[PDB]
């Protein structure tokens, strides 16, 4: 995330790091949200490649031992049936990862709370994006988990000509756009946490930013709207 600040140690316990094997090492590629002890919600584009993936929960610093990490393999990947890698603007950028083993919940590993189906945030709702993604457009991943305050931009405004126009759909949530702060590559698949009735809930799965760059004025970060997918999520967990 660009223009963020380091998150307090595990203040976002449902945030996970999705990593793939590179030779004999592991590289972080995307974020995700732990939604069941053995299920992770991420972006479908994060798993377009047929790589070996692992999920790390309780993570904070990617390249240093935090003493709280749990590592687990991904046993099954269920991508939304309508996802089309050639058309991220069509939406459906969401996938569920069934973990090889259930992780242990504790102070650093907790389930993310999802909104009620159909919920839409009022314009300018307070939200935070979190992740280890690039700290600058075409930059490098962050070592420690970052967070940025990104107020929502409602559909009417977000789909206007000066913003994203027709590229954005109602199945998405836009947030930020101030030209300073934003999600970026590597935050993809991670959460957009927003305060709802005293509870932070994960309303978005990071999907895309402008081809011109991450922090671009009037090009808010775009997320898959989690509340449009509650039934699908429940159905996947129920049939696996
Ligand atoms: O009402 Se909704 O979340 O677009 O199905
Ligand atoms: Ca670590």
Curated annotation (Swiss-Prot):
Q: What is its EC number?
A: 3.4.21.36
> Entry's InterPro entries?
Peptidase_S1_Elastase_sf (IPR050850), Peptidase_S1_PA (IPR009003), Peptidase_S1_PA_chymotrypsin (IPR043504), Peptidase_S1A (IPR001314), Trypsin_dom (IPR001254), TRYPSIN_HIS (IPR018114), TRYPSIN_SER (IPR033116)
Q: Which cofactor does it need?
A: Ca(2+)
Q: Where is the Peptidase S1 domain?
A: 1-238
What gene, per UniProt, encodes this protein? CELA1
Q: What general EC class does the enzyme of this chain belong to?
A: hydrolase
CDD domains to which the protein is assigned, alphabetical: Tryp_SPc
Which terms in the Gene Ontology molecular function aspect does this entry carry? metal ion binding; serine-type endopeptidase activity
Describe the reaction catalysed, as an equation. Hydrolysis of proteins, including elastin. Preferential cleavage: Ala-|-Xaa
GO BP term, example: proteolysis
| A Gene Ontology term for the protein's cellular component | extracellular space
Q: What superkingdom heads the lineage?
A: Eukaryota
- Keyword set, alphabetical order: Calcium, Disulfide bond, Hydrolase, Metal-binding, Protease, Secreted, Serine protease, Signal, Zymogen
Q: Which residues bind Ca(2+)?
A: 59, 61, 64, 69
Query: Where in or outside the cell is it found?
Result: Secreted
Main location per UniProt? secreted
Cofactor descriptive note: Binds 1 Ca(2+) ion per subunit.
Q: What is this protein called?
A: Chymotrypsin-like elastase family member 1
Function according to Swiss-Prot or TrEMBL: Serine proteases that hydrolyze many proteins in addition to elastin.
What is the tissue localization of expression for this protein?
Answer: Pancreas. Basal layers of the epidermis, hair follicle and sebaceous gland epithelia (at protein level).
Could you tell me which SUPFAM superfamilies the record lists for this protein?
Trypsin-like serine proteases (SSF50494)
* Family as reported in the entry's similarity comment: Belongs to the peptidase S1 family. Elastase subfamily.
Bridged cysteine pairs (disulfide): 30-46, 127-194, 158-174, 184-214
Q: Where is the organism placed in the taxonomic lineage, from the top?
A: Eukaryota, Metazoa, Chordata, Craniata, Vertebrata
